Ligand binder design. Structure first.
Ligand SMILES: [Mg+2]
Ligand SMILES: [Mg+2]
Length: 208
DNA sequence: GGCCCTCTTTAGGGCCTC
């Protein structure tokens, strides 16, 4: 009934990033939010700790106008409250390592919607920032797009949430914190629903 | 931004991770 037993020792952390393009190697990371998860005594999954950072474009970063048009971020607004990629990820890594330790897990796995996108940008930023002992799995992810495909027959984040009976506000979409929060609730609902229907634990699946 | 589909090509709009 513990978090460490649910995903073979992986500590699931929900991540959403905002960027200045689709190229993780060359395009700026502009924003990141992280949500750790916890399991109660009954084995139900729910959000734990929330982190959120506005990120300064790394020196020499490429910025695509169409991306900025999409996410509405102005990297030149001085009142952004932006910090370096190093600062943002160092704090996220610290909180995640603390969570891994306390929960008895072995390492973290990124939960994200179309997770390869966020995973690729996180790894790139961590490499640029020279961060060491990255607690995230270097290639495995929990993609909520695929999970929603299974659980709900939908792959688009907004539609998956709506289909799951969740609230989803289009006026708040495409903002990092809101997207991460909805993705975390969606992941938790998918996992909890599997348990409600008797698919987990495996002993329950074997009944009748 | 650009590939893809089609009620296509002398084009528009869906895609839905930025
Ligand atoms: Mg996203
Ligand atoms: Mg987003």
């Amino acid at each position: 009934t513990g978090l460490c037993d649910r995903f073979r020792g992986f500590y699931p952390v929900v991540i959403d990033v905002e960027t200045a393009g689709f190229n993780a190697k060359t395009d700026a990371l502009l924003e990141i939010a992280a949500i750790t998860l916890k399991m109660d005594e009954q084995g139900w999954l729910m959000p734990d700790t929330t982190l959120h950072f506005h990120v300064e474009p790394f020196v020499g970063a490429n910025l695509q106008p169409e991306a900025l048009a999409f996410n509405g971020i102005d990297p030149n607004d001085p009142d952004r409250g932006a910090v370096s990629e190093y600062e943002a990820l160092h704090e996220i890594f610290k909180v995640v390592r603390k969570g891994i330790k306390a929960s008895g897990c072995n390492r973290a796995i990124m939960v994200a919607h179309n997770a390869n996108f966020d995973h690729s940008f996180m790894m790139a930023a961590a490499e640029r920032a020279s961060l060491k002992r990255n607690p995230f799995h270097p290639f495995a992810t929990f993609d909520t797009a695929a999970l929603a495909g299974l659980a709900l027959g939908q792959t688009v984040l907004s539609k998956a949430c709506q289909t799951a009976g969740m609230d989803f506000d289009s006026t708040q979409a495409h903002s990092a914190l809101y997207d991460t929060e909805r993705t975390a609730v969606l992941f938790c609902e998918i996992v909890n629903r599997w348990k409600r229907l008797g698919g987990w634990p495996l002993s329950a699946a074997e009944e009748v």
